[PDB]
Structure 1
C-alpha cells in the first residue's frame, strides 16, 4: 500500500496503541530565519517539508509555537505559522480522509497561560478535524481508528498542564498524561546507551496495549549534532524493527526521528499487520 494512505488499510477496530507509528522530532525545523542558517548544524532536524513528511508516511508531528502563533525553535523563527501548519494538515486529511495524525503542540516559552487562550480561535476554526470528547469525561482512554478517521489527536504541552478545552469539548489530551509512556533522553547520551533505551521502550510497548509510547530516537550533544545521531541510530533502529517483524512482534508505538529516510519510514509501517 502507498505511504500516503497506509492507515486507511487498517481495521477500524484497531486501537491506536496497538500500532507502530513513524514520527518526526521538531517537525518544522527544516527551514528558518537567518539565525537558523547560522546555527544550522545544531538547529536542523529535518530535510522534508511538513507536507512531504505526511506523504512519506509520517503520522506523528511535533510542533513548537509561541503566543504570536508562529513556529519556533527557541529564539529561532522557523518561517512558518500555526495557521499555515493547520491548513497543511487539514488539506492532507481532506485528500486522504482515512488517515489520522497525532500532534504534539508545545508552548515554546512555558511561563504563561496566554498561549492557551491565543491558540483557541485557531483550533476552533478547524474543530471538525480534531478528535474531541466531552469536558465532563476523565476516562483518557486511547481511541480506535474508527473514532479518529480523518482527524487530529492533539497532545497539548504548556504551562497549564491540562488538555485544551474549548466550550464543552476537550480537544485531544495532555502531553505527558498517565496513559502515555515517554522516552526522551535527549541530553547527550552515548549512542550505545541511547540505543538500549530505544530498544527497551519498543520492547515494553509491544507488551502493553492500553498506553501510548512516545519513543524518541532523536538526541543532541555539544560534540554531536542531531544529524550525526540520526546517521548512527536510524539504521540500527530500522534493523531492529525488521527483526521484530520476522518474529511476528507488532505495536512498537511511536518511533520519533530526526532526518528519517523514506526507506526507514516504510519499514516501520510494514511492522503493522494488514
Structure 2
C-alpha cells in the first residue's frame, strides 16, 4: 500500500508490506512469556509476570510474535505454564484469540513460539508433541508450508515456530539448537540462519549491551533475507526488591526504543519484549514497526 501512514495502524501494519517479503526480513515486534497477564498473586508477580494485558491488547499493539510455553495435562490438553506454575490460561484460549484477531484483520499473521515448559502430567495419555500436533496443529489456520516463510503465504493464519523436538508433521519454522542463556547462531531450515539473543539472567549493563550489539549486526545485515534475527529485550532476576521483569522493562524498553529512533535503521529484527503497553516514553513496539518504512 503506497502510503507509509499504514505502519501507524497497529492492527493492520502488515498490510502495506509486499506479499513477497520473508517473515525473517520484516522487523516484527514480539512478546515474551505472553500468557502471564493473569498473575494476580503479589509473590508470583515479582517473579513470573512479564505482561499486564491479554493476547488481544497484545496483538492490537502491533505484536505479531508470541512466546507460548505450556504443559501436557491429565485431561489430554495443553495449558499455559511458567516453570511449575499453572498460569490460568490455556492453549485453546490463545489460538481462539488469534483467530478472532485475524478474522478482523486478515492482512496480519502471527508467529506462535511453543515450548514444553514443564513435564507432562503423571497421568497423561500421549506425548507432548503428538497431543499438540493431533489435537491443535491439525487445524487449518496453521500454515503447513516451510522453507523461507514469505508474508504472502502467512497472511490470515498462524505461523508456528517450533521450540520442541519430536515433531512429526511438517510446517512452520523447524525447531533448532538454541543454547540456554546466550547469543547464538545456527541454521534453521536448509535455507536460513538464526541469531538469537536470549541472554536472560544477566546484569542490566551486559543485557542492554548484548541487545544493542545484536541489533547492530542486523541493522547492518539489513539485506540478507536468509537470516532470522531474534532479539529478547527481556531481563529477569531476583524480583521483589526491584529486580522484577517490570523494573527492567521500564528502562530497557524506552532505552532500546530510543536506540532505534536515533539510528533510523532499515532492519531491527524480531524484538521480543516484556510489558508491552503505552506508558514507556517511546514505546519499543511502535519503533520496531516504524522501521519497516524502508520496505514499503
TM-score range, shorter chain: 0.7 to 0.9
* Cα-to-partner distance string for 1:110-153 (whole Å, 9 max, x where unaligned): 58981111112332452x211213xxxxxx63222112111222
Q: Equivalent residue for 1:182?
A: 196
In the alignment, which of 95, 104, 111 is matched to residue 95 of structure 1?
104
In the alignment, which of 128, 136, 139 is matched to residue 115 of structure 1?
128
Q: Equivalent residue for 1:257?
A: 273
Unaligned runs of 5+ in 2: 1-5, 178-186, 188-192
TM-score where L is the length of structure 1? 0.86
Q: Equivalent residue for 1:63?
A: 68
What SS does structure 2 have at the residue aligned with 1:215? strand
* Cα-to-partner distance string for 1:48-89 (whole Å, 9 max, x where unaligned): 111110111100100111012111111211111111111111
Runs of 4+ in 1 over 4 A off after TM superposition: 110-113
Cα deviation, residue 97, structure 1: 1.2
Unaligned runs of 5+ in 1: 134-139
Q: Report if aligned partners of 2:141, 2:158 keep a CA contact under 8 Å in 1.
A: yes
In structure 2, C-alpha distance between the alignment counterparts of 1:81 and 1:221, rounded to whole Å: 26
Q: Equivalent residue for 1:232?
A: 251
TM-score where L is the length of structure 2? 0.80
What SS does structure 2 have at the residue aligned with 1:5? coil
* Cα-to-partner distance string for 1:4-46 (whole Å, 9 max, x where unaligned): 01001211112212221111100011114x7x44321111100
Cα deviation, residue 260, structure 1: 2.2
What SS does structure 2 have at the residue aligned with 1:198? helix
Q: Report if aligned partners of 1:104, 1:175 keep a CA contact under 8 Å in 2.
A: no
Q: Equivalent residue for 1:244?
A: 263
Q: Equivalent residue for 1:51?
A: 56
Q: Equivalent residue for 1:269?
A: 289
In structure 2, C-alpha distance between the alignment counterparts of 1:210 and 1:267, rounded to whole Å: 23
1:13 lines up with 2:24 in the alignment = no
Q: Report if aligned partners of 1:244, 1:250 keep a CA contact under 8 Å in 2.
A: no
1:106 lines up with 2:147 in the alignment = no
What SS does structure 1 have at the residue aligned with 2:234? coil
Q: Equivalent residue for 2:91?
A: 82
CA RMSD of superposed structures (Å): 2.0
Structure 2 CA distance for partners of 1:37 and 1:142, relative to 1, 3 Å: farther
In the alignment, which of 144, 162, 180 is matched to residue 132 of structure 1?
144
Q: Report if aligned partners of 1:93, 1:99 keep a CA contact under 8 Å in 2.
A: yes
Q: Report if aligned partners of 2:72, 2:119 keep a CA contact under 8 Å in 1.
A: no
